[PDB]
Amino acid sequence: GTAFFQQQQLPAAMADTFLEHLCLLDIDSEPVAARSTSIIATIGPASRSVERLKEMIKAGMNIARLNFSHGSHEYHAESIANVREAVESFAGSPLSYRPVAIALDTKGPGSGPGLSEQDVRDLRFGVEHGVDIVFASFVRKASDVAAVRAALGPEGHGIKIISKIENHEGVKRFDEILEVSDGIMVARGDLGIEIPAEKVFLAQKMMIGRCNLAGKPVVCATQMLESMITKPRPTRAETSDVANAVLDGADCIMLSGETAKGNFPVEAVKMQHAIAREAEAAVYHRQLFEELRRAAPLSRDPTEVTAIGAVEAAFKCCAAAIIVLTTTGRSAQLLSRYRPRAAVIAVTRSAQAARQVHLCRGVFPLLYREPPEAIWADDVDRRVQFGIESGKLRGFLRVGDLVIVVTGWRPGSGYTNIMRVLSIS
Amino acid sequence: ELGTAFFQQQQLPAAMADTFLEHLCLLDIDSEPVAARSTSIIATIGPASRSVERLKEMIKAGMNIARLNFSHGSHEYHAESIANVREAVESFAGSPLSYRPVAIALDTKGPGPGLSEQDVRDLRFGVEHGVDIVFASFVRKASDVAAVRAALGPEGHGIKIISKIENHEGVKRFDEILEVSDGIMVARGDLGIEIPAEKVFLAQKMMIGRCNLAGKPVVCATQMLESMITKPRPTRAETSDVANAVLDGADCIMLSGETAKGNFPVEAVKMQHAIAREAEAAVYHRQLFEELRRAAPLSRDPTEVTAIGAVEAAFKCCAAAIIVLTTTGRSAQLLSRYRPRAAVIAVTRSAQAARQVHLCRGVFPLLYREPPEAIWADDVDRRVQFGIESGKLRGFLRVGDLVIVVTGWRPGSGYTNIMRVLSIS
Amino acid sequence: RADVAQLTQELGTAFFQQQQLPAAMADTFLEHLCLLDIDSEPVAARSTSIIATIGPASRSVERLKEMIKAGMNIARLNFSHGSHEYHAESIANVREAVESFAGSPLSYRPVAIALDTKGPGSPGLSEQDVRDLRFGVEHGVDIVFASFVRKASDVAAVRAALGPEGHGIKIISKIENHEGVKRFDEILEVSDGIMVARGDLGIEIPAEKVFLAQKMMIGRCNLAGKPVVCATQMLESMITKPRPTRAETSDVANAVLDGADCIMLSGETAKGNFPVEAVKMQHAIAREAEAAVYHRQLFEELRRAAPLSRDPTEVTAIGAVEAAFKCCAAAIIVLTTTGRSAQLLSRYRPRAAVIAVTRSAQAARQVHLCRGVFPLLYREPPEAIWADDVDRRVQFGIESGKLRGFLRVGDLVIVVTGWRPGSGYTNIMRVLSIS
Amino acid sequence: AFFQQQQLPAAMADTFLEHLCLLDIDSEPVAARSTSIIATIGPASRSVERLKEMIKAGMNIARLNFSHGSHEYHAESIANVREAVESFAGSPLSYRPVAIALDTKGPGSGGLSEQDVRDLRFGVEHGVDIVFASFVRKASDVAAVRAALGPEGHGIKIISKIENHEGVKRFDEILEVSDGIMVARGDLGIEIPAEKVFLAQKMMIGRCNLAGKPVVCATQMLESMITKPRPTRAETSDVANAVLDGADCIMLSGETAKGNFPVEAVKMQHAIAREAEAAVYHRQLFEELRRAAPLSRDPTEVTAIGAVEAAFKCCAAAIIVLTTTGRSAQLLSRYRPRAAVIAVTRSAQAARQVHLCRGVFPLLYREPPEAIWADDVDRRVQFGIESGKLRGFLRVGDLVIVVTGWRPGSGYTNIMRVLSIS
Ligand SMILES: COC(=O)C[C@](O)(CC(=O)N1CCN(S(=O)(=O)c2cc3c(cc2O)C(=O)c2ccccc2C3=O)CC1)C(=O)OC
Ligand SMILES: O=P(O)(O)OC[C@H]1O[C@](O)(COP(=O)(O)O)[C@@H](O)[C@@H]1O
Ligand SMILES: O=P(O)(O)OC[C@H]1O[C@](O)(COP(=O)(O)O)[C@@H](O)[C@@H]1O
Ligand SMILES: O=P(O)(O)OC[C@H]1O[C@](O)(COP(=O)(O)O)[C@@H](O)[C@@H]1O
Ligand SMILES: O=P(O)(O)OC[C@H]1O[C@](O)(COP(=O)(O)O)[C@@H](O)[C@@H]1O
Ligand SMILES: O=C([O-])C(=O)[O-]
Ligand SMILES: O=C([O-])C(=O)[O-]
Ligand SMILES: O=C([O-])C(=O)[O-]
Ligand SMILES: O=C([O-])C(=O)[O-]
Ligand SMILES: [K+]
Ligand SMILES: [K+]
Numbered sequence A: 001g002t003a004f005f006q007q008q009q010l011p012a013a014m015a016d017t018f019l020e021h022l023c024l025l026d027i028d029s030e031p032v033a034a035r036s037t038s039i040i041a042t043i044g045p046a047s048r049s050v051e052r053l054k055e056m057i058k059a060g061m062n063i064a065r066l067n068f069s070h071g072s073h074e075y076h077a078e079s080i081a082n083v084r085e086a087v088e089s090f091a092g093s094p095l096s097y098r099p100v101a102i103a104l105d106t107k108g109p110g111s112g113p114g115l116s117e118q119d120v121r122d123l124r125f126g127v128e129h130g131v132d133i134v135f136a137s138f139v140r141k142a143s144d145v146a147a148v149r150a151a152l153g154p155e156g157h158g159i160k161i162i163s164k165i166e167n168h169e170g171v172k173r174f175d176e177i178l179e180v181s182d183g184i185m186v187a188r189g190d191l192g193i194e195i196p197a198e199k200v201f202l203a204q205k206m207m208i209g210r211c212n213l214a215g216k217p218v219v220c221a222t223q224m225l226e227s228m229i230t231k232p233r234p235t236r237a238e239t240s241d242v243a244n245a246v247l248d249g250a251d252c253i254m255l256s257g258e259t260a261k262g263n264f265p266v267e268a269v270k271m272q273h274a275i276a277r278e279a280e281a282a283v284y285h286r287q288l289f290e291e292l293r294r295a296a297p298l299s300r301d302p303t304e305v306t307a308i309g310a311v312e313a314a315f316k317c318c319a320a321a322i323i324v325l326t327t328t329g330r331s332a333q334l335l336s337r338y339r340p341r342a343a344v345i346a347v348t349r350s351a352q353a354a355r356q357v358h359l360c361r362g363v364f365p366l367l368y369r370e371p372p373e374a375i376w377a378d379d380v381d382r383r384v385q386f387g388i389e390s391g392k393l394r395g396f397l398r399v400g401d402l403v404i405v406v407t408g409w410r411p412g413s414g415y416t417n418i419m420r421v422l423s424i425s
Numbered sequence B: 001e002l003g004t005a006f007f008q009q010q011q012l013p014a015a016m017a018d019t020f021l022e023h024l025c026l027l028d029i030d031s032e033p034v035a036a037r038s039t040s041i042i043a044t045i046g047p048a049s050r051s052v053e054r055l056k057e058m059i060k061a062g063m064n065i066a067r068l069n070f071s072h073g074s075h076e077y078h079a080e081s082i083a084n085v086r087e088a089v090e091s092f093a094g095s096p097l098s099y100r101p102v103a104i105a106l107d108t109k110g111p112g113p114g115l116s117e118q119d120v121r122d123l124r125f126g127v128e129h130g131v132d133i134v135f136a137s138f139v140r141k142a143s144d145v146a147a148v149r150a151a152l153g154p155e156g157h158g159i160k161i162i163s164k165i166e167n168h169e170g171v172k173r174f175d176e177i178l179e180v181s182d183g184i185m186v187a188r189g190d191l192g193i194e195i196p197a198e199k200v201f202l203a204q205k206m207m208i209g210r211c212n213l214a215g216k217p218v219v220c221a222t223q224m225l226e227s228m229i230t231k232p233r234p235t236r237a238e239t240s241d242v243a244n245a246v247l248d249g250a251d252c253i254m255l256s257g258e259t260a261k262g263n264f265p266v267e268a269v270k271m272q273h274a275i276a277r278e279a280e281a282a283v284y285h286r287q288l289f290e291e292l293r294r295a296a297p298l299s300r301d302p303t304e305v306t307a308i309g310a311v312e313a314a315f316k317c318c319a320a321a322i323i324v325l326t327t328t329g330r331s332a333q334l335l336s337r338y339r340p341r342a343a344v345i346a347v348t349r350s351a352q353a354a355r356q357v358h359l360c361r362g363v364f365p366l367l368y369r370e371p372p373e374a375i376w377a378d379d380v381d382r383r384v385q386f387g388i389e390s391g392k393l394r395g396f397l398r399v400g401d402l403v404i405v406v407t408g409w410r411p412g413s414g415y416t417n418i419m420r421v422l423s424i425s
Numbered sequence C: 001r002a003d004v005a006q007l008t009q010e011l012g013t014a015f016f017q018q019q020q021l022p023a024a025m026a027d028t029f030l031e032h033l034c035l036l037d038i039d040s041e042p043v044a045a046r047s048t049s050i051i052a053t054i055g056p057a058s059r060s061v062e063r064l065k066e067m068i069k070a071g072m073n074i075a076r077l078n079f080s081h082g083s084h085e086y087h088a089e090s091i092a093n094v095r096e097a098v099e100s101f102a103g104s105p106l107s108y109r110p111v112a113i114a115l116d117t118k119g120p121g122s123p124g125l126s127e128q129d130v131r132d133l134r135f136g137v138e139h140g141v142d143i144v145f146a147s148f149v150r151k152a153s154d155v156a157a158v159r160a161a162l163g164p165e166g167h168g169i170k171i172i173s174k175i176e177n178h179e180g181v182k183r184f185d186e187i188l189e190v191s192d193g194i195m196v197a198r199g200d201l202g203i204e205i206p207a208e209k210v211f212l213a214q215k216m217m218i219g220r221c222n223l224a225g226k227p228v229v230c231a232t233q234m235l236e237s238m239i240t241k242p243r244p245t246r247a248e249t250s251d252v253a254n255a256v257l258d259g260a261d262c263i264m265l266s267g268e269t270a271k272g273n274f275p276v277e278a279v280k281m282q283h284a285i286a287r288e289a290e291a292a293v294y295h296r297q298l299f300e301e302l303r304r305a306a307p308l309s310r311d312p313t314e315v316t317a318i319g320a321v322e323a324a325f326k327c328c329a330a331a332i333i334v335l336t337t338t339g340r341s342a343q344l345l346s347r348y349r350p351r352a353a354v355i356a357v358t359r360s361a362q363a364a365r366q367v368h369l370c371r372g373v374f375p376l377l378y379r380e381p382p383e384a385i386w387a388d389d390v391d392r393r394v395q396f397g398i399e400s401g402k403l404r405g406f407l408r409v410g411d412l413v414i415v416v417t418g419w420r421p422g423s424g425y426t427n428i429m430r431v432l433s434i435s
Numbered sequence D: 001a002f003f004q005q006q007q008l009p010a011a012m013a014d015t016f017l018e019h020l021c022l023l024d025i026d027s028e029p030v031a032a033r034s035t036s037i038i039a040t041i042g043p044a045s046r047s048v049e050r051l052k053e054m055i056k057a058g059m060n061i062a063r064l065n066f067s068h069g070s071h072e073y074h075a076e077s078i079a080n081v082r083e084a085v086e087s088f089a090g091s092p093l094s095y096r097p098v099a100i101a102l103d104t105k106g107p108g109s110g111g112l113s114e115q116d117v118r119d120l121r122f123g124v125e126h127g128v129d130i131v132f133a134s135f136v137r138k139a140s141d142v143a144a145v146r147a148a149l150g151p152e153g154h155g156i157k158i159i160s161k162i163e164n165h166e167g168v169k170r171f172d173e174i175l176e177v178s179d180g181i182m183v184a185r186g187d188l189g190i191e192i193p194a195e196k197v198f199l200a201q202k203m204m205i206g207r208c209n210l211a212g213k214p215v216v217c218a219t220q221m222l223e224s225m226i227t228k229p230r231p232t233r234a235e236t237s238d239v240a241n242a243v244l245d246g247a248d249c250i251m252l253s254g255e256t257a258k259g260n261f262p263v264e265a266v267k268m269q270h271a272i273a274r275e276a277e278a279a280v281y282h283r284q285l286f287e288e289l290r291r292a293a294p295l296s297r298d299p300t301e302v303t304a305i306g307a308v309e310a311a312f313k314c315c316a317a318a319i320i321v322l323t324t325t326g327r328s329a330q331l332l333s334r335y336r337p338r339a340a341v342i343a344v345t346r347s348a349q350a351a352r353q354v355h356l357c358r359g360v361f362p363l364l365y366r367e368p369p370e371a372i373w374a375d376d377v378d379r380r381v382q383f384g385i386e387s388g389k390l391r392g393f394l395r396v397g398d399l400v401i402v403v404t405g406w407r408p409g410s411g412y413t414n415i416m417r418v419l420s421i422s
């Protein structure tokens, strides 16, 4: 229908130049796709209540950030427990259950050279409490990441390390830091004090571009909706900042004082959700997919090869979703790096992977709880149907939609190799 | 892994270029072609190429389609030539490395206003003798194609109709002719008499471009190696013409008097084979695939969606081949329209589809004759492995190579929807 | 590397590390972002004009001299506040601060005066707007920022209220509501330019949609070759704090990257504790953002979207901008009476500064609306031979350019002139080497 | 109607594929033929009357093959060419200059041969404009030809013929010291596999276009026309593809030297080249030439790109340029404008040599001088406009781009002007 092609900035998406794309942007073209940029909310006194955390999960919070610069281990353990209680209160309905990752943000090495002794103790606390992600403060070189990795020990091998770039050295040694990190955070607060304030946007845009090229998650952080700490509505500069972080290519956007200590934590999450949805429809996919495709090197890894085939197939038919089965989240991450317009519905049995895939733009995790079927192909089919039924319930899919289904040839991680075109019945 | 020597062959430095101009500048006479020749050679069978022994030499030299010109000879003469072609083709049923299907094409005498009486009788002869293709002379409008289609009786609806555009009217009404035809032949002999000789190249390039856009086969014909009727080597203009027909986007190249009456029929086939191989490596796939992709409309047909995903996957890993299971040839034709560098190995049970897919550039048919397995998934696997083993035997594949496999979810034509990435073991 | 090798050996590797030149040579926008370098210092003069709203914090002649030195190009007088007497005194103080630098014509900086109307409030032009518009004509304002423009007839009403004596005043239509956005094309057609008035726009339409309206309007104005201003809350927190937030610097940079010709300061300069520091911050961000513009795609897209033209000024402008990019020209010196020849150069977004030499004091103030235009007011009486008068004006631009650091010995400059006196005859482009 | 002619619908296409799809056999070429025709002069094309017919048919450069004939024979051919050329000098607004090119025998079994030294000396003595140097294998071969031309042959253009594997492999070093290149397909097709010649041709044409130096496509382009009145389908395609590849010149050898249809072969090349030039996809070509061309601080180079950009912006009928050596016209030609480059020169040699550059139409200025240099320039510019009007390039109401310098003498081009005709 013509109405379908007027929504989600589709006239602007068909443009032959970026300039014509901008000219075709329409404030009356409503977003239809699910919001794909994850929201990280910092936990604090304004957002620790189990009832308030349920409201924040409903508003769109995907990752709960524990800022280890404030509070003791006992404070952070109560934070984790309240987060988990609010998250599990929705587990009774598996088709709508929303996993929420827990991220530990370290205090950092102040005047110190390597990992501080408080960071070693906090990192071990994170492993003991099962945190999914570490936002490592003031990462200046590859050896800082290795030290964080070593402090996590053998039991924390699965924890994702997102390096926070907060100073000139981190920006200059960015390539070597990205190579050993799982992702990056553009920590604009310290960065804006360490380098001239008028240069932070160059560092943000460069880091987001390089992370998009590398296919690794990038978070835009600090003062995105600052005035909402005290005011019910943000400034014109703040909504523009959130929209531009999404247009830049950020996988995640963050709220600090806005959720940790402010008077409007739920509204700040709702505002980021509303802006991100509008900005995602305004992305010029024609140029973006072409440039990601051109820049990505050749690969002999079947997961990487299946991912680009599936993203190309999704664009060809305007697929509502790409449903992928994943154990570690890697197959969903490889789909996400090509920035499909189609939602990537990731079905997994790993509760940790379901939480961690929120780092990748456009990945919607579904935690599958059923015990395995005796026939492996039936187990695969049951999981795919769970993705379809959840997708229908949540509004991602309707009967008649085309979906791309990504699976593997045998059980266990690392064997994704199949792409299949499916009609929703 | 593949080595620097691999990336110096088949014009790979010219293929990585960012502009067409830089691509031309990087063309290297020392960069040897490695891929199998993908543009089919149509040879006109006449007194110089009629004998079974001469036909075996022409099959070995590269002839894919035998053309019988019903403007000359008689029904009895052409039936004997057809029987000699089939005898020479079946003499290789012993060695899988030498057995290659050869299509039989009937070229009509032509039109008075509508279809001629002789054409009706010749078309009936073609149906009775099981011809695969009809090259319909002097097609001027859509109703001419409908008349040929009606003349293909109750038993010849599977025969492909390739409309020969030979005059101003055919050029002007090209779009309506292409819409109802299976393909087109740029019949340059009559076209060069009907319109100014200096305009034929415009008509050739336009028709090849529109056929490439439509995903329908296009043949370049007449005087390609004319001087080889009497001389053992062609002129500089002739080799250039063959190379440029391939670079233009032609699916097939043809030999007329060169093979029908000339002194060097086998040498003319060998020359077309040598030039086509060199020209195919010189194709600028980066721009071609992007333009075919951009111009092709969105599709909700799973075969079309799977085909673009498979071609994208093949380029990503430098796949040696795309193995496709097809009954009518349609799934192989849809892969061919995106012009993959990978060979499209089409595994089929249909002897007719195996001969007809020679019309599509880059399609290597394999006729499968094993009895169907009781379990459909095992029958599919047996055919996929047949494509791999024939590929290994013929030099398309080696252990460790990556192949793309295109299949459907259920038996019968019209259900292709799966693309798998396979490692050759 | 071959397309820059000889120029790299000549100008040096240090030259090609500055002003985001490695990012500018990128083949894709993605690679351009990846090559952005915080250590690549801006060299070019700041080309996006700063509009500062004048109020109690920025009214004194001494404070205005500091704001002119910090980079203020246009002084805005908001007729929603104050009075005729109050605004006349602010205007006189702006003119006194501006003329304190007139002693040296080779370095003098013109400042435009813009009147922002109160608006229609609760259908047509209000009676207060008619009186304020008349005040503007009587006080010789250069620009009118017309509030709440909703249709083409609103701009015709403002034009009529300016009368025959205000024919030269530029009308910049403020788009502040849904109707203005929907009828944008008809409004732009009859306006001299547009202002994305985000304060009211953010109340009239959902706050999360303002960025779509801003980006669309800036893109359409860039396509039309007409000035566009980004306004409201750009550095809001600087009303009370000496440093802005991370979102505020980002907003200023993104307005410039979007294609805005001007950026504005409202409460930041009208009532804030740091008016000069707010101007300095906008200046610092705009210079960094201008160097980060991906000119390769921008110039190609402006060129591809612009229709063919038989107007020699339009034809000369694209030839001059192409020539400037080819040699990395330090400047394009253009002679203009109305500012139009400089505006046509500005629409192709050259990296080279457009030094506009004019005898019209009003055109010198008004060209601040066009990105990258640096006005030079020529005060000498005309030479007897017209060709010598033209040559003197070109040399005035070169000497001012050398004195201000815009030009250096060895630089190439593009000079744009016409074949006969009077407006509308620009048709010549010359390549000159600076000695 | 203007936008239906000269493949303008195909020129507005957003992709090369859509450009091909929009090519129309009914879209007639309007622009003057840009690719020069080189005709080999021999027994079939030696008479003054036959040469007048060949000049009228479109011959721009007369080639004398020093592998055949003798010094006396070639001197008589040269005198006949000059007599046929000067028979049109009575009307200076329509006079067509014709270059004279000497094609050397080559080194054969051996540096520069002794016959080549004598033939090169003959060329200097007879005032030839160009040398097509046979079997150039390396940069030192070009230096040897340059030395054999001596001080009196400082201004003869050396076009290196690439005829073997070594010439192809050492192409970059040869192009660097040569004025241009000839893709000599006859020997090249014997020296390397015949099926690889198209790769060498396309590579060399691309590199010469990149370098802004003339490239000639040669041998067997219309071979069958040696005995038949019409060419084959492969032959017309070859001529069209050489033009679409980016060749500045196309050549006729036996077709004009010994063939039964020399005038018809020239007419056929003219007809094909005109059709192929309109079919060029300028949108991609100009963009790629622009992107690949390096940044420059030379004002002639800077003015040239500004003038070509301005010409495309207004659909200028022509770019009128004043040149002494032909260099300013060559720098305009390298950007492949659709607008004709009308080069007004006082140098008879530069007028002949500038036929090597695609789209350059030389006008030999023989009008009285103006006392004021500024008046003399304006007169040479109005001369371009009167010749352009007479020859069909320009009409009243057309826009032209005029390229001049700031001071007399070569090397000072720095001005571009937009002018309305009459
Ligand atoms: C004025 O004759 C014409 O009609 C001109 C003509 O060009 C035909 C025409 O004379 N041609 C075009 C074809 N070539 S051909 O490709 O070499 C050719 C030859 C033959 C045969 C087919 C064929 O294509 C053949 O089947 C045959 C059968 C039995 C004995 C001999 C032959 C035979 O010689 C010969 C020259 C046209 O337009 O066809 C309608
Ligand atoms: O993204 P990952 O972690 O590589 O997981 C992909 C794996 O998931 C699957 O689709 C399903 O595997 P399981 O049955 O073990 O869950 C495998 O076939 C595939 O290899
Ligand atoms: O190209 P076609 O004619 O549609 O044939 C493709 C068909 O071949 C298959 O891959 C195999 O089917 P069969 O087992 O019937 O041969 C189907 O699943 C698919 O629909
Ligand atoms: O930009 P505008 O307003 O058209 O002015 C450009 C005009 O300025 C000139 O360069 C100089 O003209 P004046 O001598 O009138 O100042 C004219 O030749 C040209 O027409
Ligand atoms: O192309 P060339 O050889 O550099 O010649 C261009 C020269 O021609 C002119 O336009 C006219 O010069 P002349 O008056 O000497 O003929 C010069 O101003 C310019 O330097
Ligand atoms: O650490 C942070 O979040 C910062 O500095 O912005
Ligand atoms: O019929 C043909 O093949 C022709 O006319 O070229
Ligand atoms: O009117 C204004 O300036 C606004 O609304 O921002
Ligand atoms: O010398 C030549 O021209 C050739 O060999 O083609
Ligand atoms: K912290
Ligand atoms: K026939």
Ligand SMILES: [K+]
Binding pocket: C078, C079, C080, C116, C117, C118, C119, C147
């Ligand atoms: K106001």
Ligand SMILES: [K+]
Binding pocket: D065, D066, D067, D103, D104, D105, D106, D134
């Ligand atoms: K010779």
Ligand SMILES: [Mg+2]
Binding pocket: A166, A187, A189, A190
């Ligand atoms: Mg910090």
Ligand SMILES: [Mg+2]
Binding pocket: B137, B138, B166, B187, B189, B190
């Ligand atoms: Mg025919």
Ligand SMILES: [Mg+2]
Binding pocket: C147, C148, C176, C197, C199, C200
């Ligand atoms: Mg307002």
Ligand SMILES: [Mg+2]
Binding pocket: D134, D163, D184, D186, D187
């Ligand atoms: Mg030779």
